[PDB]
Design a protein around this ligand. Structure first.
Ligand SMILES: CCCCCCCCCCCCCCCCCCCC
Ligand SMILES: CCCCCCCCCCCCCCCCCCCC
Ligand SMILES: CCCCCCCCCCCCCCCCCCCC
Ligand SMILES: [Fe+3]
Ligand SMILES: [Fe+3]
Ligand SMILES: [Fe+3]
Ligand SMILES: [Fe+3]
Ligand SMILES: [Fe+3]
Ligand SMILES: [Fe+3]
Lengths: 164, 164, 164, 164, 164, 164
């Protein structure tokens, strides 16, 4: 039987679906970059999309480990175009900060319910979000320095296209 | 410039989104098998979901190679429950036969337009569909022979849980 | 259930039986070459007979993959006497060209029915028949040049006897 | 020149053709097992068909070694269906016992003619027939013990499917 | 004797000669890049010329495999001057798209004649042309982004000069 | 700036174009040998065609090293048929002797102009032409000894077909 509350189960399932959307949004940013011919930025976003799916499956396996079940929900259509390289990465940063706040909300729900197992499980994501946000902020700072000069933006398309 | 027609680009983009849905459907079947305690069947379905993502990305890269762009659409909520193991695999077979017909329709459209590049590209998917349909039919035949015997269902769950 | 039509299943089953006969014909050619004391030509024909069985089994496995069944039919007695070495290889070429036309007829039937899976499956055989015909044409050209000279025919016997 | 009698040559050639039919019969049993969805039993029968061809070719090479020639005859249509797994293997046992008696008849004929070379050649087949018959009896014993339990028949299908 | 029609043989021979011209055109592009001091772009074009010769020899061997013969025709003088790097690669792209259409025309002729062997042979070039066009489009996108900045064009010259 | 005279540059460019024609001529001889069924002689001629391209590219790189430019000219249609194997190799010998005299004419022009760099560059070709002529003379001597004797011509075809 399920040892998380239905309310914590719902919060975790909601977050799983949010991570699925995150993966889909980053794939959409990849489609935009590929349409604009930045094959390295697109590669970076495809890798990010794969990473978000691993987040979703961590939520999946935790839900089942606590006796719950996962219900997949409809996936909203992501935006398909951005008003520039900066516009896309600013959207990514805004999205990741929203994901961080969502995880925070689950953590406090679990803590109020004295569900220490879920509180502890979420630590990994708190720490991971620190890094996700930082990587996007670093990219945005580089884009600010480039100031639209393609001499430099070529170098950064090439470097992010190196992501493993 | 785009060297596929807009109608062929649309058909290919539609199929990419269909493959994304397929992946999500197989993930949902995994949520069902895991809820029912069949971790080997669930494992098989997670592997199948990943395979469907590789199909989607094959369409993605071909579309860009012909000068088109991809637009991701909303993904419909899949079913979450089946009336038993057979019911789920029968749903999988019906879905794969629908995917095959979808591929056939693109092939016939591209052939009507004398788009030999797209006709040739689609051959890989025709052959792959033969294999996917056959593997599900094989599982259904084994389940029919098992006739609900848990000894045999345990053995098959093991076997499918070994999928690489 | 069977997802090829009965007319296509019958065409494929007919061709499987045709490939069995091909194997048997080449074994009969081996009996002739061995009776004439050309063990290298006989070796080549025994290898060709084994190759034809691999063709039959490719049809076999495709038929089952599409939900059909194979029915083996009577095997006609092959000829056992030829006028000479070149006449045997000329008969081989005529047989392979007949096999190619038989395959073409299946492809055109499948295409009429929009059975794209079977059309795609048969491509391997179209390409292979090009090679089968060409290898016999090459041997026939060498035998025409030899012009019955037993010195040269012995060299060709030793060379064909090296077939792997 | 031929140093076997024509009667012994005919007996050996008749047996070569019997071995060709044996191979074809076992391939037909494979068509039945594959239609019934027992891919391991079918695999065993495909291996047996290849073994029977090695028997035919041992007769072939001996006939030529004694200065005779081989004449291939029409091959009769084998049965395509059996009333079940045990029915098919009972047919296989009856066939192999008929093959053994046929070999015995050649041996007795050659002995009457004081053709010691052929009597000695046939000892390999006498000994091999002991093993062929015994392997079928062992499978029939296993099927008798299984008594139609699919739990056990799955085991036997996988075990026979491991045949090298 | 020839098993392609004279019309299909002439279409294939015409294409072989077109592939020879393609090779010569790319060598001429190398003469331009070397005159402009871009040794890496020139290296890329020398490698491309060699690849075009392999295309010509594939047509050569297929014509002979179907019993035809090759007749080499005069090769027209290629252009030797372009208005810049991007202009040369735009010419390469236009040339490759013309080559693709030429191949399509042969494919449609062969299909009209039910020459399934030749249609199938041409599939390889259909797929290869997809790749050739895409590789030139990728180079054109890089040159577009470079926007005449010699900093980037030096790097691109080195990179293309590494072609194996 | 160009440090060869225009007259020497034109002589070298003319010779580069002559070497291209040489390559094409030897490919045409290959088309003849393949039409006649002598795949070893054809192989030898294909290897010779590639060797002539290496000659052309040695002229190419020297022209650029001295500040000149290469202009590729139209290639004349080579003969496609010869009155036999010996006729083809006699034509090859006559061609190579013509090439040697052409190189000599460049050397004498450069010496008149005291262009010691070009005189020295051409020594490699003087020495190479000695070998080019000698290998064809050797083949012609073998063919004279063979005297149309097909037994011997087979041996010569296989030997020339081993060319690396
Ligand atoms: C290389 C880009 C990968 C594609 C990312 C797609 C993002 C949206 C996909 C929707 C979800 C589909 C189901 C995926 C389940 C994966 C489960 C296996 C373990 C990761
Ligand atoms: C040493 C060379 C051996 C050549 C043997 C070729 C025999 C050809 C006879 C064909 C007709 C009988 C076919 C029987 C079925 C064989 C199935 C084998 C694959 C499983
Ligand atoms: C770096 C080398 C570049 C050389 C390109 C030359 C293209 C000129 C075309 C002329 C054709 C001559 C015949 C060549 C036949 C070669 C056949 C064998 C090799 C595939
Ligand atoms: Fe995430
Ligand atoms: Fe798929
Ligand atoms: Fe065949
Ligand atoms: Fe036997
Ligand atoms: Fe090409
Ligand atoms: Fe030369």
């Amino acid at each position: 039987m399920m040892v998380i509350s239905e309310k914590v189960r719902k919060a975790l399932n909601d977050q799983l679906n949010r991570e699925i959307y995150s993966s889909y949004l980053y794939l959409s940013m990849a489609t935009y970059f590929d349409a604009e011919g930045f094959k390295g930025f697109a590669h970076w976003m495809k890798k990010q999309a794969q990473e978000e799916l691993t987040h979703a499956m961590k939520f999946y396996e935790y839900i089942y480990a606590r006796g719950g079940r996962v219900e997949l929900e409809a996936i909203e259509k992501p935006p398909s175009n951005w008003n520039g390289i900066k516009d896309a990465f600013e959207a990514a940063l805004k999205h990741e900060e929203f994901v961080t706040q969502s995880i925070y909300n689950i953590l406090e729900l679990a803590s109020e319910e004295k569900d220490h197992a879920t509180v502890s499980f979420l630590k990994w994501f708190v720490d991971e979000q620190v890094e996700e946000e930082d990587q996007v902020r670093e990219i945005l700072d580089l884009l600010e320095k480039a100031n639209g000069q393609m001499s430099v933006i070529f170098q950064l398309d090439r470097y992010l296209g190196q992501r493993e």
